Paper text:
X-ray crystallography-based fragment screens have taken off in academic and industry settings. To assess qFit-ligand’s ability to detect multiple conformations in event maps, we took advantage of ongoing fragment-based drug discovery efforts through the UCSF QCRG Antiviral Drug Discovery (AViDD) program to design inhibitors against the severe acute respiratory syndrome-coronavirus-2 NSP3 macrodomain. We identified previously published and new fragments manually modeled with multiple conformations (n = 20).
We created a modified true positive dataset (n = 20) by removing all ‘B’ conformers and setting the ‘A’ conformer occupancy to 1.0. qFit-ligand was then run but with an event map, rather than a composite omit map. In this use case, qFit-ligand models alternative conformations into an event map, which represents only partial occupancy of the unit cell. Therefore, we scale the output ligand conformer occupancies to estimated occupancy from the background density correction prior to merging into the full system. Following this scaling, we perform standard refinement and note that the sum of occupancy across ligand conformations is a refined variable that can be <1.
Author numbering: 3 to 169
The structure:
């Protein structure tokens, strides 16, 4: 039993809700919140810009130190950093950005990072300003993640479309 409330169950291990991931994180304080990161951990917009704003820019300060030490992530890769006031940990995961020409096959590799964590709160990788089809992102998620994932979809219209079209 966990504290996630109001989710629709899609499969044995995947759940979905129309919610602002920022507000959902502040209430649940999950062990792991997933960020829709880029390789530079520049949290300017989308989910990343919103999460970073909620930390009063502390996520960005920590991220800049991480990059100065380690260099950029790989597309499809991840790193674990602090969750600040939102969660114990933040798993920064880089899905391919279609508006940059990155290979969509890398989306499965990106979701594989979730399997290193028993329970996560997450957005749909490569959705939104990353330019991929969110319906496809949900399919790859369900077919790749085996741990317990709670998906927050900001747009109510998109949430309804994702549920109504889910196979
Ligand atoms: O933001 C992403 O990277 C991906 C995804 N974000 C969220 O669902 C989300 C969840 N919680 C809080 C917030 C967001 C967005 C900003 C604040 C997304 C958003 C809108 C859209 F039209 C498509 C889409 F895929």
């Amino acid at each position: 039993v966990n504290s996630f409330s109001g989710y629709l169950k899609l499969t044995d291990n995947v759940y979905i809700k129309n919610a602002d991931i920022v507000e959902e994180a502040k209430k649940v304080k999950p062990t792991v919140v997933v960020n829709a990161a880029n390789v530079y951990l520049k949290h300017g917009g989308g989910v990343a810009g919103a999460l970073n704003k909620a930390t009063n820019n502390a996520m960005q300060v920590e991220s800049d130190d991480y990059i100065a030490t380690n260099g950029p992530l790989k597309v499809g890769g991840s790193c674990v950093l602090s969750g600040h006031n939102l969660a114990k940990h933040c798993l920064h995961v880089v899905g391919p950005n279609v508006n940059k020409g990155e290979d969509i096959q890398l989306l499965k590799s990106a979701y594989e990072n979730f399997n290193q964590h028993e329970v996560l709160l997450a957005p749909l990788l490569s959705a939104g300003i990353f330019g991929a089809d969110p319906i496809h992102s949900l399919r790859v998620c369900v077919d790749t993640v085996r741990t317990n994932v709670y998906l927050a979809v900001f747009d109510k219209n998109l949430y309804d479309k994702l549920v109504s079209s889910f196979l």
